[PDB]
Design a protein around this nucleic acid. Structure first.
Ligand SMILES: Nc1ccn([C@@H]2O[C@H](COP(=O)(O)OP(=O)(O)OP(=O)(O)O)[C@@H](O)[C@H]2O)c(=O)n1
Ligand SMILES: *P(=O)(O)OC[C@@H]1C[C@@H](O)[C@H](n2ccc(=O)[nH]c2=O)O1
Ligand SMILES: [Mg+2]
Ligand SMILES: [Mg+2]
Ligand SMILES: [Zn+2]
Ligand SMILES: [Zn+2]
Lengths: 929, 73, 186, 188
RNA sequence: CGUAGCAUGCUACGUCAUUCUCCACGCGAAGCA
RNA sequence: GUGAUGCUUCGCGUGGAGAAUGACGUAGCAUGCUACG
């Protein structure tokens, strides 16, 4: 062992470092590590296997191993010379790992060796890959990183769902402990870049060339240049690191005076709202060499791509500033001589400071439009209200509009004992029966609306991989190219139901009908044009839903003000109606499930996938956990149809109004105002379509990550290999949009990843061979994307996979699929959960509905829903429909008898005899009409 | 076998309690809602029946609110 | 449709059609009868259609009034109907504990708080008479809701502790009823 | 109809034809009087069709006018209601502190979220449990938002008045949480 | 064989009285997602 | 105090296209008869 011990002593290199080998002698160690690689052969951010380094761990003075390694690299003499010259230039930099270049006589020649000293076990690439490809089944690098840096204890993983943001919120704290380390890395990166710029060195910075102490090494692809003309390339580094900067809360130190976690928080001026210079200082401190212009206020952005780019940074930086500085910017105006307080702007976490362009001071009179705008604004309500310190929630509470807090309970449903008695008489609800009651009306106590509103704590500031998102948005907009949008006039707007709530404060004077009749088309178009130049902050009212369900949850929806809804309709309805009128597309909103629609949708999603497997998923707490960046992206995708009617300023101000009204607006939940952290307001004009855009974006992101995180050398298909190479180039090396490759990737996804999207519900028919080879996204890739880009852990109880396509999707829109011989051919029919239909029959939300004789069309609709169960191979499910038919016959008999008793008439109404025979319902699923 | 009868009976019992203005007591209504929702989300008949006894204790506690003798002829 | 002024015209013309065709008359008579019969047919169709519309309107209005009357009846009698339904369902359940507590309530022995389920369970039960006491209690054990409870104290009508030995058939007139027994679940 | 003279002309023609038939028509000219009857019938039916059409169109227009008047009358109601609410809120906010903070602003705009914080004279604290009570608003006076608040009142979820002595670790189970504590800004 | 007048059969268009199939919209009720 | 959107069933009303039965006006093809030339 003389040779091995001599090599061990030489690696010390004067620096006494108590080394112990990781492999047998001078034999090169092999590890499985994440590399962000791009060359003429391969491109991607994947886990490769390196076998060209020897690791010697340093041990503390008391024989305790520490996280210090002496990685000894064996080189060709040429690269050994090349790296030495670069290092001698970069020696003086304090962010460069110490290197020791020597030559060792292995067998008969002086082989060159380069020892990187006191390197951490893992790199920044390993941390980024562990958090961006999270697999609960095998996360050992992440666990070892957490334990090694005292983020948690090794027993912390003995919990079940220790990684779950919802089940285990404390994981956030455990991740936040990493933030400072990440921050230091960022700082050191800047230093390194400076050195390069000062040394005239041109090279690409990758995550795998930096350790978790922030030191840098490699220098293999660095090339000399004029000393002052060094050009660091940091697109891949920063872009891949971005999702980790908010998960670990790296910039928390910026909230403390002198940027020190020991010192207390900065005491910002309470009246301050313009942090533009602070945002610029943060950007220069951390992302100094990010070579794309950053606009702290997105009103100055060039297009929607620039808006997303700069809103990502604004999302990162707004976590440093006090929450009281965000929201409407209220000025004092004088109208008719009296002083009003009116919102004359808005400070957005993402869009920065926006100022209304039409701020008329010293006004003489208020018309209906101005009066409506002032009533909608939360400036008066919050300014004249009391102060609120609601401790029941973590969401920021603004004011109490009433001297008493409102506690709204949810009451139980009404029991239809007639139908239940009939059902049990017909042999239902017996012990051991496959069909049992599971859907009820669950009652709630006073803390119901606030408890459900508190679920917005799952919304966290989420910085996105911007270079990835700017390509995913183009591929997603490729899905919305067969649609026609644009603004319409007030007289072209269609309102389905005018007897709905107008929101707050407008619900205390009438319904939406009142304000659609009082507002003339001239007034409505004036309001729309106003919202194209000014931001109107509205109040959203959180209303509980009285619905039958199997889960004991009190759903809360957002009643958005009439002012917001009117303009949002006038802005988006053309595109929304184009989407709903289209058949055969990915988004299947507006497609009926009757008259063969289900079969058509399934045959369309199946398309011609080569090795078809089906998969599907549901987003847990979809509206509460949606990142603000993805909602802004969805709004921009929908608004991109306005290239001929709206200018850049008009589109931006419409985006700002949408954000101020349905993204982080003021929420009135029980007579008190709170600040919504983010996420969709379920109840806006575009909730169902923004969700579809978000779902498509998540799926495209999953496919991108699946294809780039795949070892490029192991792809046996040259087309897919070149596609991966071009995908990496278009993400992290091309600045503009490559339309040709966007179309290529869209065609690839359509050919191998056929989708069927309806809001948060999705069904994918995918090529199973590609998915197994890693060429298209699988459910694991979707979980990984959701973990870091949605801050929700998706369990396998929320997802499903189907190998046999003749079984259809396991579930879609709460419907199961059955392939049934309907005439001469087999068709896919949807059937519901029998418990759902039985609960609808038995439990109701109105006392008058417990009398079936008055409500017979109700049971006819329920039977229409339940018909496809007769084709089920289970006799209980089949009997469910016959139960409804018999009960409809009984109800008609009872109604006739009652009409004969009360009056001296004869109904003799057997045009209704078709409601208790199967043909009426069988005709609802035949493709005739 | 007395598992769908218990859930329907609990629904009717909470409706009756709601009619008797039990929401005016935050604690009592919270307990009633807890019992009702637990019975609805129940698979064991014995647990459901003990919770049903507890829930009916709320109705029987208020002596003057209802006239039990007439109701149970 | 019958008993209409044009119905008689229709009957007469159609009856005369057979006589005309079987009378061996000229075809001019045939054309005349065709004209008259068809004119009466159209007039009677108009009258029948209008009468059908009137009957349909009457049927619709009658149905709507029936529905409103039934809705008013259903809403007005919600309380008593729901209570009767509740006790019918409870009787159908035929549980031991539910029947026990309901019978005790009918006898006047009602609780003062939710009947606890855990072993660490304090229950206060009112007792309006000695007979119900001896039926539902003996010694230091109290049977209620198909469970055993261990008595702790009895505090009479006007709060004043009472020893168990002080409750007996001879002693009942002295005690200040109703009593309140607080007990722990067995 | 009867009012229109065309109906009168038809009635005269039909009466003449009926009288001629009863008295005994010549032969072929009775067909001509019937022909005049038929012409009158066609013209009168055409006139009556337009009569009904115009009558129903006028009824539709009267209904439209009624609905428009009602809409214009409800617009005034909602306008007056909004004006009254705005004036109430104007006379409901303290002008002194609001003016002071707005004048301290560098340009005129201030965040809305600080208006109640720095100017509200009354605070409402909603306490879910007793630990939060002892942590936040223990005692008669407490400090929040860099200001001193003198507890004015405490109520429960049932709006029953609660004395500060009732709130205690042992008596917490007997209170109908959450508690609402109303406090007044001490010395502004 | 022409003209005027009268009578019979067949056919086109126009306007009305009645019914019904399908549809575009409006209003009301309900069900599901 | 009860949101956004989609689809579906029922009832009612107006409207457009079209089908059927029937009264009846104008014009035209064409059979029979009286008168003038
Ligand atoms: N009454 C409803 C129900 C659902 N949605 C939309 O449907 C989406 C998802 O529905 P759902 O999955 O049922 O709600 P979740 O919040 O996702 O709850 P869960 O955890 O069960 O998935 C929501 O974002 C919501 O905006 C809606 O607009 N109105
Ligand atoms: P079902 O399983 O209820 O939901 C399927 C799909 C998801 C959701 O966005 C949308 N939906 C459902 C129910 C509802 O009331 N509104 C709604 O938009 O459809
Ligand atoms: Mg979901
Ligand atoms: Mg869903
Ligand atoms: Zn920009
Ligand atoms: Zn536009």
């Amino acid at each position: 062992s003389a040779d091995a011990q001599s090599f061990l002593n030489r690696v010390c290199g004067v620096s006494a470092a108590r080394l112990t080998p990781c492999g047998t002698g001078t034999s090169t160690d092999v590890v499985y590590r994440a590399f962000d690689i791009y060359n003429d052969k391969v491109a991607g951010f994947a886990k490769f296997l390196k076998t060209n380094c020897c690791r010697f761990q340093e041990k503390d003075e008391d024989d305790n191993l520490i996280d210090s390694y002496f990685v000894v690299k064996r080189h060709t003499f040429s690269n050994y010379q090349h790296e030495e010259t670069i290092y001698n230039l970069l020696k003086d930099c304090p962010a460069v790992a110490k290197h020791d270049f020597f030559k060792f006589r292995i067998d008969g020649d002086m082989v060159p060796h380069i020892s990187r000293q006191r390197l951490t076990k893992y790199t920044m690439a390993d941390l980024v890959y562990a958090l961006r490809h999270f697999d609960e089944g095998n996360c050992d690098t992440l666990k070892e990183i957490l334990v090694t840096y005292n983020c948690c204890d090794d027993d912390y993983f003995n919990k079940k769902d220790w990684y779950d943001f919802v089940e285990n919120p404390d994981i956030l704290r455990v991740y936040a402990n990493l933030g400072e380390r990440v921050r230091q890395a960022l700082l050191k990166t800047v230093q390194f870049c400076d050195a390069m710029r000062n040394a005239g060195i041109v090279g690409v910075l990758t995550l795998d060339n930096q350790d978790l102490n922030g030191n840098w090494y490699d220098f293999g692809d660095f090339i000399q240049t004029t000393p002052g003309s060094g050009v660091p390339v940091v697109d891949s580094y920063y872009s891949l690191l971005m999702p980790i900067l908010t998960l670990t809360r790296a910039l928390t130190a910026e909230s403390h005076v002198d940027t020190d976690l020991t010192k207390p928080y900065i005491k910002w001026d309470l009246l301050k709202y313009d942090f533009t210079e602070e945002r610029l200082k943060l950007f220069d401190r951390y992302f100094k060499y990010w070579d794309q212009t950053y606009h702290p206020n997105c009103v100055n952005c060039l297009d929607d791509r620039c808006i997303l780019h700069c809103a990502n940074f604004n999302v990162l930086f707004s976590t440093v500033f006090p929450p009281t500085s965000f929201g409407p910017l209220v000025r004092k105006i004088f109208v008719d001589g009296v002083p009003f307080v009116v919102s004359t702007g808005y400070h957005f976490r993402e869009l920065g400071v926006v100022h209304n362009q039409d701020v008329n001071l010293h006004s003489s009179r208020l018309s209906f439009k101005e009066l409506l705008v002032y009533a909608a604004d939360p400036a008066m309500h919050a300014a004249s209200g009391n102060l609120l310190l609601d401790k029941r929630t973590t969401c920021f509470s603004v004011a109490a509009l009433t001297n008493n807090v409102a506690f709204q309970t949810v009451k139980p449903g009404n029991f239809n004992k007639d139908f239940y008695d009939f059902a049990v008489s017909k042999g239902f609800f017996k012990e051991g029966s496959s069909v049992e009651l599971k859907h009820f009306f669950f009652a709630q106590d006073g803390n119901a609306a606030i408890s459900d509103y508190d679920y917005y704590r799952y919304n966290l500031p989420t910085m996105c991989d911007i270079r990835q998102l700017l390509f995913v948005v183009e591929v997603v907009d490729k899905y919305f190219d067969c649609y026609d949008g644009g603004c319409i006039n007030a007289n072209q707007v269609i309102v389905n139901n005018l007897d709905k709530s107008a929101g707050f404060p407008f619900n205390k004077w009438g319904k939406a009908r009142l304000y659609y009749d009082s507002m003339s088309y001239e007034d409505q178009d004036a309001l729309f044009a106003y919202t194209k130049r000014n931001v109107i902050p509205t109040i959203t009212q959180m209303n509980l839903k009285y619905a039958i369900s199997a889960k004991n949850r009190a759903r809360t929806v957002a009643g958005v003000s009439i002012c917001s809804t009117m303009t949002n309709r006038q802005f988006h309805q053309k595109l929304l109606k184009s989407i709903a009128a289209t058949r055969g597309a990915t988004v299947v909103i507006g497609t009926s499930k009757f008259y063969g629609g289900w079969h058509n949708m399934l045959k369309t999603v199946y398309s011609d996938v080569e090795n078809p497997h089906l998969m599907g998923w549901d987003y847990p707490k979809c509206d509460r956990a949606m990142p603000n960046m993805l909602r802004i992206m969805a709004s921009l995708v929908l608004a991109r149809k306005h290239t001929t009617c709206c200018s850049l300023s008009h589109r931006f101000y419409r985006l700002a109004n949408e954000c101020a009204q349905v993204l982080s607006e003021m929420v009135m939940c029980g007579g008190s105002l709170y600040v919504k952290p983010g996420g969709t307001s379920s109840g806006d004009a575009t909730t169902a379509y923004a969700n579809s855009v978000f779902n498509i974006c998540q799926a495209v992101t999953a496919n991108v990550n699946a294809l780039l995180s795949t070892d490029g050398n192991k792809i046996a298909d040259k087309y897919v290999r070149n596609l991966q190479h071009r995908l990496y180039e278009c993400l992290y090396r091309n600045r503009d949009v490559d339309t040709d490759f966007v179309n290529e990737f869209y065609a690839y996804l359509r050919k191998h990843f056929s989708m069927m999207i309806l809001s948060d519900d999705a069904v994918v028919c995918f090529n199973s061979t590609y998915a197994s080879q890693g060429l298209v996204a699988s459910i694991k890739n979707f979980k990984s994307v959701l973990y870091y880009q949605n801050n929700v852990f998706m369990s396998e109880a929320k997802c499903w996979t189907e190998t046999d396509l003749t079984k259809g999707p396991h579930e879609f829109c709460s419907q199961h699929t059955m392939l049934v011989k309907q005439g001469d051919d087999y068709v896919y029919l949807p059937y519901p959960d029998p418990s759902r239909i039985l609960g609808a029959g038995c439990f109701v939300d109105d006392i008058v509905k417990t009398d079936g004789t008055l409500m017979i069309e109700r049971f006819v609709s329920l039977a229409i829903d339940a018909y496809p169960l007769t084709k089920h191979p289970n006799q209980e499910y089949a009997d469910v429909f016959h139960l409804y038919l018999q009960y409809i016959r009984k109800l008609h008999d009872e109604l006739t008898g009652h009409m004969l008793d009360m009056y001296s008439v004869m109904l003799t109404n057997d045009n209704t005899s078709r409601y208790w025979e199967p043909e009426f319902y069988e005709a609802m699923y035949t493709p005739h009409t | 076998s007395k598992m769908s009868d218990v859930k329907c009976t609990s629904v009717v019992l909470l409706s009756v309690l709601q009619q008797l203005r039990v929401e005016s007591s935050s604690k009592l209504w919270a307990q009633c809602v807890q019992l009702h929702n637990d019975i609805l989300l129940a698979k064991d008949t014995t647990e459901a029946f003990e919770k049903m006894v507890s829930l009916l204790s709320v109705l029987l506690s208020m002596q003057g609110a209802v006239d039990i003798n007439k109701l149970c002829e | 449709f019958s008993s209409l002024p044009s119905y008689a015209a229709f009957a007469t013309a159609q009856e005369a059609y057979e006589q005309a065709v079987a009378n061996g008359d000229s075809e001019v008579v045939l054309k005349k009868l065709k004209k008259s019969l068809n004119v009466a047919k159209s007039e009677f169709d108009r009258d029948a259609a209008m009468q059908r519309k009137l009957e349909k309107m009457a049927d619709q209005a009658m149905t709507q009034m029936y529905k409103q009357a039934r809705s008013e009846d259903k809403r007005a009698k919600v309380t008593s109907a729901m209570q009767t339904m509740l006790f019918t369902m409870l009787r159908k359940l035929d549980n031991d504990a539910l029947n026990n507590i309901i019978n005790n309530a009918r006898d006047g022995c009602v609780p003062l708080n939710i009947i606890p389920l855990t072993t660490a369970a304090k229950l206060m039960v009112v007792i309006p008479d000695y007979n119900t006491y001896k039926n539902t209690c003996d010694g230091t054990t109290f049977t209620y809701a198909s469970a055993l409870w261990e008595i702790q104290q009895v505090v009479d009508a006007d709060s004043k502790i009472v020893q168990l030995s002080e409750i007996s058939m001879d002693n009942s007139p002295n005690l200040a009823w109703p009593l309140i027994v607080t007990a722990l679940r067995a």
